């Protein structure tokens, strides 16, 4: 977050969607604030934060759910799962939703790690913990993002449109409460996450189930074609 007011840190959509979490907002960017004040550090860099609020809430079609950013420094965009186009290798995570994007959709192995096409085209790419303390996984668990990305979400469900949900941070019983009281929502089930990866998450089909599920909802379907 930031000093800003929502209006001015968000989309539009976004700013009207996340009213009610407004206050909690800016206790976050206080809380980061007093990090740097207390010698640590936090990832992704500030202005990515709250970057999955950049793209129009009115398009979004698609939401794939993750927990906590990239612990590793030059990893966190803000975009769930997503890496900077210059990082090579790709983290594990990223290189196994990739074997499966080349073997649900048929296309080629993308040329980097770079998720911005998916989150242009309606794919909310949202961590339910938005920060992380770098070297130091889920270190931002219970800091208060927790009621942010659920108020995303339960907002997202409460639209007259239709919505498919990939959970790739577990939380099932967690996260299916909160998406069961929308109107045209389907949940992707079950629920392996990229590591899982040939105990479940290889060949869930997650890219061509969402498009077969949109369609049948009225929906375009997701291009999910990278270059």
Not at 82 to 102: G, K
Not at 183 to 206: D, K, M, Q, T, Y
Request: net charge positive; charged share 20%; with cysteine.
């Amino acid at each position: 977050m930031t000093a800003r007011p929502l209006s001015e840190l968000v989309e539009r959509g976004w700013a009207a969607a996340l009213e009610p979490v407004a206050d909690q907002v800016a206790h976050m960017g206080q809380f980061l604030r007093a990090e740097i004040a207390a010698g640590r550090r936090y990832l992704p860099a500030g202005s990515n934060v709250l970057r999955a609020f950049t793209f129009p809430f009115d398009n979004v079609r698609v939401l794939i759910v993750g927990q906590d950013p990239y612990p590793t420094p030059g990893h966190a965009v803000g975009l769930s799962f997503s890496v900077a186009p210059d990082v090579r290798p790709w983290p594990r995570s990223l290189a196994n939703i990739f074997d499966e994007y080349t073997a649900d959709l048929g296309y080629p192995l993308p040329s980097n790690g770079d998720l911005t096409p998916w989150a242009q085209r309606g794919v909310l790419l949202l961590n339910r913990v938005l920060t992380v303390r770098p070297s130091n996984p889920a270190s931002h668990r219970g800091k208060g993002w927790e009621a942010v990305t659920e108020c995303a979400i339960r907002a997202l469900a409460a639209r007259a449109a239709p919505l498919v949900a990939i959970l790739w941070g577990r939380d099932a019983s967690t996260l299916k409460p909160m998406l069961a009281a929308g109107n045209c929502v389907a949940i992707e089930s079950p629920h392996p996450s990229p590591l899982s990866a040939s105990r479940g998450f290889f060949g869930s089909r997650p890219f061509s189930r969402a498009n077969e599920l949109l369609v049948g909802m009225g929906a375009e379907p997701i291009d999910w074609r990278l270059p």
